[PDB]
Design an enzyme around this catalytic site. Structure first.
Site, PDB file in Angstrom:
ATOM      1  N   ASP A 115      22.360   8.519  13.935  1.00 30.44           N
ATOM      2  CA  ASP A 115      23.118   9.531  13.229  1.00 30.44           C
ATOM      3  C   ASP A 115      23.979   8.759  12.228  1.00 30.44           C
ATOM      4  O   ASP A 115      25.034   8.222  12.571  1.00 30.44           O
ATOM      5  CB  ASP A 115      23.996  10.320  14.216  1.00 30.44           C
ATOM      6  CG  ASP A 115      24.776  11.412  13.549  1.00 30.44           C
ATOM      7  OD1 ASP A 115      24.356  11.851  12.466  1.00 30.44           O
ATOM      8  OD2 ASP A 115      25.810  11.845  14.110  1.00 30.44           O
ATOM      9  N   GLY A 166      28.656  15.988   5.469  1.00 31.65           N
ATOM     10  CA  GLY A 166      28.700  17.401   5.817  1.00 31.65           C
ATOM     11  C   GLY A 166      27.406  18.187   5.692  1.00 31.65           C
ATOM     12  O   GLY A 166      27.390  19.393   5.940  1.00 31.65           O
ATOM     13  N   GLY A 216      27.616   9.986   6.131  1.00 31.17           N
ATOM     14  CA  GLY A 216      27.063  10.625   4.959  1.00 31.17           C
ATOM     15  C   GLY A 216      27.239   9.831   3.682  1.00 31.17           C
ATOM     16  O   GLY A 216      28.163   9.023   3.585  1.00 31.17           O
ATOM     17  N   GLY A 234      24.769  18.179   7.581  1.00 34.59           N
ATOM     18  CA  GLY A 234      24.232  18.597   8.866  1.00 34.59           C
ATOM     19  C   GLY A 234      23.512  17.563   9.691  1.00 34.59           C
ATOM     20  O   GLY A 234      22.671  17.917  10.509  1.00 34.59           O
ATOM     21  N   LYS A 235      23.833  16.284   9.490  1.00 34.70           N
ATOM     22  CA  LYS A 235      23.196  15.205  10.225  1.00 34.70           C
ATOM     23  C   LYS A 235      23.513  15.243  11.729  1.00 34.70           C
ATOM     24  O   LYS A 235      22.606  15.187  12.561  1.00 34.70           O
ATOM     25  CB  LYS A 235      23.621  13.843   9.642  1.00 34.70           C
ATOM     26  CG  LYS A 235      23.252  13.635   8.161  1.00 34.70           C
ATOM     27  CD  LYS A 235      23.831  12.323   7.610  1.00 34.70           C
ATOM     28  CE  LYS A 235      25.361  12.305   7.665  1.00 34.70           C
ATOM     29  NZ  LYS A 235      25.979  13.277   6.729  1.00 34.70           N
ATOM     30  N   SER A 236      24.805  15.315  12.067  1.00 34.76           N
ATOM     31  CA  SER A 236      25.236  15.355  13.474  1.00 34.76           C
ATOM     32  C   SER A 236      24.790  16.627  14.203  1.00 34.76           C
ATOM     33  O   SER A 236      24.429  16.571  15.366  1.00 34.76           O
ATOM     34  CB  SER A 236      26.761  15.244  13.561  1.00 34.76           C
ATOM     35  OG  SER A 236      27.194  13.978  13.094  1.00 34.76           O
ATOM     36  N   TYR A 237      24.831  17.755  13.525  1.00 36.50           N
ATOM     37  CA  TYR A 237      24.409  19.007  14.141  1.00 36.50           C
ATOM     38  C   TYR A 237      22.945  18.866  14.550  1.00 36.50           C
ATOM     39  O   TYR A 237      22.537  19.289  15.639  1.00 36.50           O
ATOM     40  CB  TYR A 237      24.564  20.163  13.156  1.00 36.50           C
ATOM     41  CG  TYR A 237      24.140  21.503  13.727  1.00 36.50           C
ATOM     42  CD1 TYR A 237      25.041  22.295  14.454  1.00 36.50           C
ATOM     43  CD2 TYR A 237      22.830  21.963  13.575  1.00 36.50           C
ATOM     44  CE1 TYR A 237      24.640  23.507  15.013  1.00 36.50           C
ATOM     45  CE2 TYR A 237      22.424  23.168  14.129  1.00 36.50           C
ATOM     46  CZ  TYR A 237      23.333  23.932  14.848  1.00 36.50           C
ATOM     47  OH  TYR A 237      22.888  25.104  15.403  1.00 36.50           O
TER      48      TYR A 237
HETATM   49  N1  ANP Z   1      21.494  24.243  10.969  1.00 39.53           N
HETATM   50  C1  ANP Z   1      22.734  24.443  11.081  1.00 39.53           C
HETATM   51  N2  ANP Z   1      23.196  25.633  11.624  1.00 39.53           N
HETATM   52  C2  ANP Z   1      24.533  25.943  11.786  1.00 39.53           C
HETATM   53  N3  ANP Z   1      25.509  25.129  11.447  1.00 39.53           N
HETATM   54  C3  ANP Z   1      25.100  23.949  10.913  1.00 39.53           C
HETATM   55  C4  ANP Z   1      23.794  23.560  10.728  1.00 39.53           C
HETATM   56  N4  ANP Z   1      23.777  22.334  10.183  1.00 39.53           N
HETATM   57  C5  ANP Z   1      25.035  21.967  10.044  1.00 39.53           C
HETATM   58  N5  ANP Z   1      25.908  22.912  10.471  1.00 39.53           N
HETATM   59  C6  ANP Z   1      27.407  22.881  10.466  1.00 39.53           C
HETATM   60  O1  ANP Z   1      27.870  22.397   9.226  1.00 39.53           O
HETATM   61  C7  ANP Z   1      28.752  21.207   9.370  1.00 39.53           C
HETATM   62  C8  ANP Z   1      27.954  19.885   9.030  1.00 39.53           C
HETATM   63  O2  ANP Z   1      27.876  19.276  10.315  1.00 39.53           O
HETATM   64  P1  ANP Z   1      27.652  17.749  10.760  1.00 39.53           P
HETATM   65  O3  ANP Z   1      28.998  18.049  11.303  1.00 39.53           O
HETATM   66  O4  ANP Z   1      26.419  18.355  11.259  1.00 39.53           O
HETATM   67  O5  ANP Z   1      27.605  17.119   9.255  1.00 39.53           O
HETATM   68  P2  ANP Z   1      27.162  15.580   8.863  1.00 39.53           P
HETATM   69  O6  ANP Z   1      27.079  15.411  10.268  1.00 39.53           O
HETATM   70  O7  ANP Z   1      26.294  16.347   7.975  1.00 39.53           O
HETATM   71  N6  ANP Z   1      28.664  15.300   8.302  1.00 39.53           N
HETATM   72  P3  ANP Z   1      29.323  13.820   8.056  1.00 39.53           P
HETATM   73  O8  ANP Z   1      29.171  13.165   9.354  1.00 39.53           O
HETATM   74  O9  ANP Z   1      30.792  13.980   7.792  1.00 39.53           O
HETATM   75  O10 ANP Z   1      28.776  12.875   7.033  1.00 39.53           O
HETATM   76  C9  ANP Z   1      29.254  21.440  10.818  1.00 39.53           C
HETATM   77  O11 ANP Z   1      30.368  22.336  10.818  1.00 39.53           O
HETATM   78  C10 ANP Z   1      27.994  21.977  11.515  1.00 39.53           C
HETATM   79  O12 ANP Z   1      28.335  22.680  12.740  1.00 39.53           O
HETATM   80 MG    MG Z   2      28.039  13.471  11.278  1.00 39.03          MG
END
Ligand code: ANP
Ligand code: MG
Length: 324
Positions: A239, A98, A242, A100-103
């Site tokens: 990607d 969570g 986590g 923010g790797k995928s974002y």
């Molecule tokens: N820079 C950023 N700005 C806005 N939202 C963000 C940002 N980085 C992450 N998020 C949000 O926070 C959450 C973490 O997203 P991602 O879904 O990016 O996590 P991971 O990918 O970090 N998670 P995981 O795959 O479960 O191990 C999501 O709801 C994203 O949309």
């Molecule tokens: Mg992810």
């Protein structure tokens, strides 16, 4: 000889953190990131120095905010240029579940929030299409896979429910047997494949890894004789799942490989992920790590762990040579 580039990015608070009235323990100034330990407030805060520091904890209205476009135009364009120079390149996102790797890598396919992968693809095709020398021709092939519990699935071929075999070619290194490799001639085509691939992923803590590969071939035609010297660069955008079994072998092994490389046998073969990425970690590749960080007090240990692995990654160095 090229060291692994390392960037850290801190995101805004998520629902869990807001609900616990979390305070921000991450501070950034220049290339320095400092973490406060909420448990021991009077202990000295730990500081780390990195190639890139993305403060994305607030919002785009902030002058110091690091947006998707800014993260890409920075580290992303850097790696894309290396690919044009003929180097293999790799960018992998690492961090707590969570964080923010995928974002950062994929973002959202909507208004303004596209991550590194879509932007790089768009940039790649835009550049190819702006070529004005007719002695230059190009080919772009893409592959997209998922690694879940040491098993590999082809994201561009959902029809297939068999997990592909990771093998070691006797002379050319690791590869995924029968992994789809589609030629694409436009950004739109590659983006449809990306979208199709993203939907077939599983499926809310991820414990699968996604690897998006682009084989970028540059063909230079020499006028006089008719040989065409090729230039090939593999672009691997990763990607990762986590960090917090067969479900976690790859992530733990990556940690050991990263530590071992920083320390300098290496257990590359201890997992499918480190096996396939062997050359990107300590081989002929220009590699970068994007470490995603939670800003919340409640995640101090995990965040500190990420900062430490990112710190070691900085010490990795790889012998690079252009593929001409
Ligand atoms: N820079 C950023 N700005 C806005 N939202 C963000 C940002 N980085 C992450 N998020 C949000 O926070 C959450 C973490 O997203 P991602 O879904 O990016 O996590 P991971 O990918 O970090 N998670 P995981 O795959 O479960 O191990 C999501 O709801 C994203 O949309
Ligand atoms: Mg992810």
């Amino acid at each position: 000889g090229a060291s692994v580039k390392v960037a850290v990015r801190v995101r805004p608070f998520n629902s869990r953190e807001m609900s616990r009235d979390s305070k921000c323990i991450i501070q950034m100034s220049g290339s320095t990131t400092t973490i406060v330990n909420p448990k021991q407030p009077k202990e000295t805060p730990k500081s780390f120095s990195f190639d890139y520091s993305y403060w994305s904890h607030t919002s785009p209205e902030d002058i110091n905010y690091a947006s998707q476009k800014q993260v890409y135009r920075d580290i992303g364009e850097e790696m894309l240029q290396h690919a044009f120079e003929g180097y293999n390149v790799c960018i992998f996102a690492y961090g707590q579940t969570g964080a923010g790797k995928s974002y950062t890598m994929m973002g959202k396919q909507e208004k303004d929030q596209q991550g590194i992968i879509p932007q790089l693809c768009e940039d790649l095709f835009s550049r190819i299409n702006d070529t004005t020398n007719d002695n230059m021709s190009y080919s772009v092939e893409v592959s997209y896979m998922e690694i879940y519990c040491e098993r590999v699935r082809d994201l561009l071929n959902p029809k297939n429910k068999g997990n592909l075999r990771v093998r070691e070619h006797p002379l050319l290194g690791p590869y995924v047997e029968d992994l789809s490799k589609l030629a694409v001639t436009s950004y739109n085509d590659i983006q449809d494949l990306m979208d199709s691939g993203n939907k077939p992923r599983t499926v809310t803590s991820s414990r699968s890894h996604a690897v998006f590969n682009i084989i970028f071939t540059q063909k230079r035609h020499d006028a006089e004789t008719n040989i065409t010297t090729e230039k090939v660069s593999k672009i691997s955008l990763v990607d990762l799942a986590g960090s917090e079994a067969n479900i976690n072998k790859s992530l733990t092994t990556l940690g050991k490989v990263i530590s071992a490389l920083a320390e300098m046998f290496i257990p590359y073969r201890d997992s499918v992920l480190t096996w396939l990425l062997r050359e990107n970690l300590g081989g002929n590749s220009r590699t970068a790590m994007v470490a995603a960080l939670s800003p919340a007090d409640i995640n101090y240990d995990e965040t500190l762990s990420t900062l430490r692995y990112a710190d070691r990654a900085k010490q990795i160095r790889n012998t690079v040579s252009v593929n001409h």
